[PDB]
Write a protein that binds this ligand. Structure first.
Ligand code: MN
Ligand code: MN
Ligand code: MN
Ligand code: MN
Lengths: 254, 255, 257, 257
């Protein structure tokens, strides 16, 4: 199938190169439209106030001086004579798990892909802070997910957030559908003093009160499972609408 | 009630000052923990790799050199001897509507407020530019906060509020909305910068935009305060049982 | 005279409002062209890859979504129907001293002023942080005093003044002092600490005693409550090195291994 | 000799890998301490408000989540058990010429090298954008040739070399040329265009004919297929201006208005 591949680590990131190579090996057409530089931990929103510069790097590769969402958006709205069936974003050089996902650049690209009407998959390698990162494994996971989606499509308002354990494929215990975890809640605040004497604050390490037990994406990748979290792209809480609608009439009554 | 107020325009933004002032006028205790500078269009994720510096500005105000989520997170996890019942983020100097909301700094602050277990409300003034009625959004805010004291939100839910940049009298009312979508329509414009390079504008949202009745766009366009209850948990639970079968295959045969 | 005022702390910075007002109260005409937000930790170079938006806040104030150099550049190249005699950048909320000067946003605006052929002054408040209030008026007083002088005593070729003002009242100020740039970087060791996770992080330590902050330097001046004025290059070309480098450069033209 | 290699395009940049390898193939020991990501449009100043993470990619390569100056600083102040004789920063994917030099990330790393007492060279490839491939080998060849010379001919006090390499094969290269910094900023007008919405935006225009890119300048050299070597100040202090500024500064000790 026609795959549009982006990332947020940059168009020259080893992750996206290996992902694209893998996807072509599987028989897929792969256009790559990805940031000129690493924009991990940068804002993810579509650039609207300035024009975006996009140079071509090869016949299948574009380097966009903009966000990952800019990339996919440009890629799907005129930058290419290319109608991809799917958007694959990755492979991220770090995992994107739990409440980090909402602000993940890698995920943002996939979200834009779904915003513009395409099945999208975010792929992140859960590299541990410790040797070379097993991008081949995530790429392996990717080409397998893409294949299954060709014959079995995702629901509407849904992308797949995929996290792959930084191990060989043989060492992978398998695929595991998960919900998003939560490490923010537990993470306390640490008051310390920098060398210049200023008071600084560390977001503390996530305590035991973390939502990282069974069923979470954390728990999966921790136990060497490829985590597949189907996530919203529409943030609207429809379940709370009629309840807020009834709440708002009470609000406006007063 | 005890209100924690943040924003993403900065601690000195007129929006947040007016919001805090209003909320105190309503009788609420208001701690303000907000970015040192404008971080609109900056990354929203919790800072973890570096420590955050937070100076106190007054007895109720903290200037945090970090993200809006850093602000609320620090504010709720040790920076304050203060247990707020609610987190109000705003007032944003621009509206946060449709598919912009996911990446809104103002919304991010409210998200963290709910992540840490508090009812949260994002407040944005829908300003079109060529003075901005912050007082109106602040009035909308203090009214929303009041109703939440006696009528609480569901779990995994914050309120994304957008207020038309008009006087309160000119406001047609409150309207619960779903998130719109302007991205889909927005095409790509190829143009040439003065130095000759090929540049690309994200085109203006065409008629194919999801901004009709029921959307937050349509509400604020027609001078209604838009209240969109949004997810905090992005997990698509309705797709869990669906994509599991899809996955079982893969987790069975491996190669 | 006509003054173009900028900074890097933002058009809303108290340092620039106070500077501009002081300069107006002194009888100068003052256009303020300054960043929309604080860019004290941003790149200083001219924005070329993208266009720059300039919002006019009032008659004599422009908010520019770009670098301090962008501000001055735009202001001097057609944004304004205005012909300034001098560029004054500041007042920076923090000091800009020694080997920090070269990467200062404040100084960058002054740099661009000189690049475009204008006398320029960077004004920074050496704040040490602690309440009260930042003595921007003091720095402003210094600024209008310095600007008065450049009206009569022109700066030499490719020179701007880097001015640092001790964060004190004007009455406490011992005076003005012409200074050279100090050096604190070499004396700043690398401190190897560990984050909460246990992972090793590296702080750049505070400047030790081996720093170049003795007599004649800007550091020494401002620490002794003296307004420091450092005339600084805008032309980085080490001209006195040209002849020397030329000598072994000529040999390299014989392209070998 | 022992070379500390950095850049601003990132530790994964082809320009720095090729530079480092060339320098090793020349028999130098080479530690690479370079940003984790491309920071070509980032601030250059030392990170002081936060700690810096350094990841060791291999024996002679460190990935640093901080500025180019952070890299060199850390590398020279305790990150490494390594005592380099020279700092070489590059190879930048784009040229760093004239009035742009002062804000160059590449140059910034070299700056910090000199600040910490080391001979330093900034190496940039004057790429003009055309497919093929960026001639980093050419620049690398230039680098190892220049580094060989500084082993024997030491640079003067507070001087680094700003080296720009024409994006050509080594055989096309006409030679090396000692140059002064050119000036394109003054010749770069402000172009007032309008975005799709109709709102007015301001481009900084391309450098017109009034630019300082004539003979003797770095621009002229690289445009004529010459490797440009500009010795540049690391000490921005305009020493030749000290006496002059001192003359009207002493007056200002009359502080009452
Ligand atoms: Mn990434
Ligand atoms: Mn904002
Ligand atoms: Mn500043
Ligand atoms: Mn660069």
């Amino acid at each position: 199938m026609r795959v549009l591949v982006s990332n947020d680590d940059g168009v020259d990131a080893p992750g996206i190169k290996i992902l694209a190579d893998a996807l072509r090996n599987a028989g897929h057409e792969v256009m790559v439209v990805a940031p000129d530089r690493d924009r991990s931990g940068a804002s993810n929103s579509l650039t609207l106030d300035t024009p975006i510069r996009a140079k071509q790097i090869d016949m299948h590769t574009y380097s966009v001086a903009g966000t990952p969402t800019d990339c996919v958006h440009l890629a799907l709205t005129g930058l290419l004579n290319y109608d991809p069936d799917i958007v694959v974003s990755g492979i991220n050089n770090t995992g994107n798990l739990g409440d980090d996902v909402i602000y993940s650049g890698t995920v943002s690209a996939a979200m834009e892909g779904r915003f513009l009407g395409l099945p999208a998959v975010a792929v992140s390698l859960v590299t541990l802070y410790r040797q070379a990162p097993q991008y081949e494994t995530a790429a392996h996971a990717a080409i397998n997910i893409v294949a299954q989606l060709k014959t079995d499509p995702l629901p509407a308002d849904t992308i797949l957030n995929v996290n792959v354990p930084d191990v060989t494929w043989q060492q992978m215990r398998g695929f595991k559908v998960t919900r998003l975890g939560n490490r923010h809640r537990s993470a306390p605040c640490l008051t310390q003093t920098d060398p210049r004497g200023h008071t600084i604050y560390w977001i503390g390490p996530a305590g035991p009160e973390q939502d990282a037990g069974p069923g979470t994406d954390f728990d999966a990748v921790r136990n060497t499972y490829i985590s597949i979290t189907p996530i919203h792209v529409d943030l609207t809480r429809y379940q709370a609408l009629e309840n807020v609608t009834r709440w708002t009439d009470r609000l406006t009554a007063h």
